[PDB]
Amino acid sequence: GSSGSSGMALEQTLKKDWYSILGADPSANMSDLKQKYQKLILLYHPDKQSADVPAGTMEECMQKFIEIDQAWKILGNEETKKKYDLQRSGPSSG
C-alpha cells in the first residue's frame, strides 16, 4: 500500500561501522567510546610521525586517521550517536 516517501539518507552516513573502527561496542557510552577515539588519534596522527617512514605507512596512516575522525563525528555528539544506534541493526529480537 503506502510506499514512496523521501527521508532515508542516500548512503551518506550512519552506514559505515563506527563501533568497529574505534574498537568499541554498540552498547557503550560516550565516556567509553571517546576513550577509544582519543587513543586512536595519536596512533595515526600526522604530527606524531617519523621522517624515517616509507610511503606506504603514510598513505595507510591517513586512511585510518580519516575513518577514526568519522567514527567520532557520529559517536561524538548526542543526537547522531542516538540516531545511529536506531539506524544500525541490533541483535534484539524474538
PDB file of C-alpha atoms in Angstrom:
ATOM      1  CA  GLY A   1       0.000   0.000   0.000  1.00  0.00           C
ATOM      2  CA  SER A   2       1.517   3.267   1.203  1.00  0.00           C
ATOM      3  CA  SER A   3       5.009   3.135  -0.298  1.00  0.00           C
ATOM      4  CA  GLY A   4       7.138   6.027  -1.518  1.00  0.00           C
ATOM      5  CA  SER A   5       8.337   8.875   0.687  1.00  0.00           C
ATOM      6  CA  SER A   6      11.546  10.896   0.983  1.00  0.00           C
ATOM      7  CA  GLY A   7      13.618  10.518   4.135  1.00  0.00           C
ATOM      8  CA  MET A   8      16.108   7.653   4.198  1.00  0.00           C
ATOM      9  CA  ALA A   9      19.612   9.063   3.752  1.00  0.00           C
ATOM     10  CA  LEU A  10      21.361   8.428   0.433  1.00  0.00           C
ATOM     11  CA  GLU A  11      24.091   6.132   1.751  1.00  0.00           C
ATOM     12  CA  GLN A  12      25.717   9.282   3.132  1.00  0.00           C
ATOM     13  CA  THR A  13      26.279   8.475   6.806  1.00  0.00           C
ATOM     14  CA  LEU A  14      25.236   6.047   9.542  1.00  0.00           C
ATOM     15  CA  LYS A  15      26.216   3.240   7.169  1.00  0.00           C
ATOM     16  CA  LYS A  16      29.887   2.568   7.903  1.00  0.00           C
ATOM     17  CA  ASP A  17      30.605   0.517  11.025  1.00  0.00           C
ATOM     18  CA  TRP A  18      31.996   3.023  13.525  1.00  0.00           C
ATOM     19  CA  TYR A  19      31.772   0.855  16.642  1.00  0.00           C
ATOM     20  CA  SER A  20      34.364  -1.312  14.894  1.00  0.00           C
ATOM     21  CA  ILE A  21      36.711   1.371  13.568  1.00  0.00           C
ATOM     22  CA  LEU A  22      37.095   2.782  17.079  1.00  0.00           C
ATOM     23  CA  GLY A  23      37.117  -0.669  18.651  1.00  0.00           C
ATOM     24  CA  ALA A  24      34.075  -0.151  20.860  1.00  0.00           C
ATOM     25  CA  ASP A  25      30.678  -1.783  21.375  1.00  0.00           C
ATOM     26  CA  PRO A  26      27.240  -0.690  20.094  1.00  0.00           C
ATOM     27  CA  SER A  27      26.125  -0.653  23.731  1.00  0.00           C
ATOM     28  CA  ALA A  28      28.907   1.535  25.123  1.00  0.00           C
ATOM     29  CA  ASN A  29      28.643   5.080  26.478  1.00  0.00           C
ATOM     30  CA  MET A  30      30.423   8.210  25.251  1.00  0.00           C
ATOM     31  CA  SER A  31      32.951   8.158  28.094  1.00  0.00           C
ATOM     32  CA  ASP A  32      33.867   4.706  26.785  1.00  0.00           C
ATOM     33  CA  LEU A  33      33.765   5.454  23.057  1.00  0.00           C
ATOM     34  CA  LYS A  34      35.762   8.668  23.446  1.00  0.00           C
ATOM     35  CA  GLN A  35      38.490   6.822  25.350  1.00  0.00           C
ATOM     36  CA  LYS A  36      38.888   4.546  22.329  1.00  0.00           C
ATOM     37  CA  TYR A  37      38.810   7.503  19.937  1.00  0.00           C
ATOM     38  CA  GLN A  38      41.479   9.538  21.726  1.00  0.00           C
ATOM     39  CA  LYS A  39      43.810   6.545  21.997  1.00  0.00           C
ATOM     40  CA  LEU A  40      43.173   6.121  18.271  1.00  0.00           C
ATOM     41  CA  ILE A  41      44.049   9.733  17.464  1.00  0.00           C
ATOM     42  CA  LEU A  42      47.733   9.719  18.410  1.00  0.00           C
ATOM     43  CA  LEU A  43      48.422   6.315  16.858  1.00  0.00           C
ATOM     44  CA  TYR A  44      47.807   7.598  13.330  1.00  0.00           C
ATOM     45  CA  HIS A  45      48.387  11.305  13.959  1.00  0.00           C
ATOM     46  CA  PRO A  46      50.369  13.063  11.195  1.00  0.00           C
ATOM     47  CA  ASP A  47      52.372  15.275  13.553  1.00  0.00           C
ATOM     48  CA  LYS A  48      53.290  12.159  15.533  1.00  0.00           C
ATOM     49  CA  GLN A  49      55.085  10.544  12.595  1.00  0.00           C
ATOM     50  CA  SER A  50      58.704   9.750  11.729  1.00  0.00           C
ATOM     51  CA  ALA A  51      60.743  11.161   8.846  1.00  0.00           C
ATOM     52  CA  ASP A  52      62.185   7.657   8.523  1.00  0.00           C
ATOM     53  CA  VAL A  53      58.841   6.272   7.353  1.00  0.00           C
ATOM     54  CA  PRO A  54      58.098   4.861   3.874  1.00  0.00           C
ATOM     55  CA  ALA A  55      55.327   5.966   1.516  1.00  0.00           C
ATOM     56  CA  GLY A  56      53.102   3.018   2.373  1.00  0.00           C
ATOM     57  CA  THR A  57      52.911   3.748   6.093  1.00  0.00           C
ATOM     58  CA  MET A  58      51.992   7.376   5.419  1.00  0.00           C
ATOM     59  CA  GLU A  59      49.171   6.693   2.959  1.00  0.00           C
ATOM     60  CA  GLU A  60      47.929   3.941   5.274  1.00  0.00           C
ATOM     61  CA  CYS A  61      48.063   6.274   8.275  1.00  0.00           C
ATOM     62  CA  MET A  62      45.681   8.725   6.604  1.00  0.00           C
ATOM     63  CA  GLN A  63      43.130   6.064   5.668  1.00  0.00           C
ATOM     64  CA  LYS A  64      42.958   5.245   9.379  1.00  0.00           C
ATOM     65  CA  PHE A  65      43.083   8.762  10.822  1.00  0.00           C
ATOM     66  CA  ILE A  66      40.208   9.620   8.485  1.00  0.00           C
ATOM     67  CA  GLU A  67      37.980   6.700   9.474  1.00  0.00           C
ATOM     68  CA  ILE A  68      38.709   7.464  13.127  1.00  0.00           C
ATOM     69  CA  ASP A  69      37.778  11.119  12.650  1.00  0.00           C
ATOM     70  CA  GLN A  70      34.467   9.905  11.228  1.00  0.00           C
ATOM     71  CA  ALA A  71      33.608   7.187  13.746  1.00  0.00           C
ATOM     72  CA  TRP A  72      33.538  10.059  16.237  1.00  0.00           C
ATOM     73  CA  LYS A  73      31.598  12.515  14.074  1.00  0.00           C
ATOM     74  CA  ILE A  74      28.623  10.259  14.800  1.00  0.00           C
ATOM     75  CA  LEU A  75      29.534   8.814  18.199  1.00  0.00           C
ATOM     76  CA  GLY A  76      30.773  12.185  19.417  1.00  0.00           C
ATOM     77  CA  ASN A  77      27.510  14.118  19.595  1.00  0.00           C
ATOM     78  CA  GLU A  78      24.327  13.220  21.473  1.00  0.00           C
ATOM     79  CA  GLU A  79      21.917  13.364  18.535  1.00  0.00           C
ATOM     80  CA  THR A  80      23.959  11.495  15.925  1.00  0.00           C
ATOM     81  CA  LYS A  81      25.180   8.895  18.418  1.00  0.00           C
ATOM     82  CA  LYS A  82      21.495   8.291  19.143  1.00  0.00           C
ATOM     83  CA  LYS A  83      20.069   8.333  15.616  1.00  0.00           C
ATOM     84  CA  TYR A  84      22.878   5.978  14.603  1.00  0.00           C
ATOM     85  CA  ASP A  85      22.007   3.226  17.079  1.00  0.00           C
ATOM     86  CA  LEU A  86      18.423   3.246  15.802  1.00  0.00           C
ATOM     87  CA  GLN A  87      19.630   3.149  12.196  1.00  0.00           C
ATOM     88  CA  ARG A  88      22.054   0.257  12.671  1.00  0.00           C
ATOM     89  CA  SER A  89      20.656  -3.230  13.271  1.00  0.00           C
ATOM     90  CA  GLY A  90      20.539  -4.890  16.678  1.00  0.00           C
ATOM     91  CA  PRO A  91      20.603  -8.477  17.994  1.00  0.00           C
ATOM     92  CA  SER A  92      17.484  -7.580  19.978  1.00  0.00           C
ATOM     93  CA  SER A  93      14.737  -9.780  18.531  1.00  0.00           C
ATOM     94  CA  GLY A  94      12.458 -12.720  19.265  1.00  0.00           C
TER      95      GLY A  94
END
